[PDB]
Amino acid sequence: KEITISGYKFKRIKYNQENFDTMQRMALDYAYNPDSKGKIAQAQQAYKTGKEDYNAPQYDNFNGLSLDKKIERYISPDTDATTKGVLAGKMNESIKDINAFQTAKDAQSWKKSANKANKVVLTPQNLYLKGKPSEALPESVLMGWALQSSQDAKLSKMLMGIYSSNDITSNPLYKSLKELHANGNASKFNANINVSNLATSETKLFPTEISSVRVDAPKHTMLISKIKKIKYVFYDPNYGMAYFDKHSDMAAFFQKKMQQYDFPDDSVSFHPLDYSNVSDIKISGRNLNEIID
C-alpha cells in the first residue's frame, strides 16, 4: 500500500497492469526516431506535438477521466497520434508515480535479499535522479570517500534528498556528480580477483583496514569497502548500501547481485580507490568534503 524509502513515502497507485503494459509498449513506438520517415515520422511528430501541448483546451474532455480510462483511450485505435501524445502528457505525473513505486518496491526487495547484512541504507538513484542518466561512477567515487570519513549516512541522505529538487540541473550535488563524472576527474582517484574468488580475497582486495574498491560493470559502477568495529560494505548506486560483519557474507551478496544483473564474470572488474590526495582534487573548485557539504 505504501513504501517509505529513507524518509520519503511512495504510495501504491491503482491501475490496470495489463493496459499499463500495453500503453508502455506503444509509447516506445511513438518515441521520436530521427531515422523514421514518411507516415511513421509524421505520427511521431504529431505525438510529440500533442505531448508537449497536453493542456490544449480542445482535449479538456480528458481532464475528468480516471487514470485507467485515460490509459484505455490511449491504447484504443480510435485515438490518433496527436491525442495519444496529449494523453501521455496528461498521464505523465501518474506514470512517474507508478514507476517510482515500483523502484521503491525493487529497493525493498533488494534490502530483503541482503539477509546477512546488519544494516541496509536504501538510496535508489532512479528515484532521486528523476530519469536523468545514471551517475553511478561519481556516486561510487564520492561514497568511497564518505565511507572512509564517516560521512556515508550524511551523503546517503543528501543523495536521496535530490528527490525533493524542483530543478535538478540547479541542484549543487547533482551538478558536482556530473562534473566528477567527466574529463577523467573520477580517474584521479585510481590507485587476479574475480567474482568467483571474491569471498576468499579479503586481505588482498583491501590492503588497509580502511579502503575502497571501485567495481566496473557493463554501463554501471559500484563500490565495495572495508571500514573500521570493522564493516564490509557493498554500495550499488541503483539501490543503496548493505553493511556486513563478515567479508564472506558481503561477497556472497555481491555475487548474487551480479548474477541478478546477469553480468558475465569477465565484465566485472575491481579497481582500488586512493583518497590520499582528496584534499587537493577540486571538482569545479570544490573538494569532495565540500561537495558532501
Technique used to solve these coordinates: X-ray
Q: Helix, strand, or coil here: 256? A: helix
Q: Helix, strand, or coil here: 51? A: helix
Contact 12, 1 (CB under 8 A): yes
Residue in 256, 253, 257 with CA at minimum distance from that of residue 238: 257
**Phi, psi at 275, each rounded to 5°:** -105, 25
C-alpha–C-alpha distance, residues 12 and 2, integer Å: 6
Q: Domains in the chain, ordered, with CATH?
A: 2-100 (no CATH), 116-291 (3.90.70)
C-alpha distance across the termini of the chain, in Å: 35
Q: Describe the crossing of helices 81-113 and 38-52 by its angle, rounded to 10 degrees.
A: 70
DSSP secondary structure letter of residue 133: P
> Structure resolution in Å?
2.0
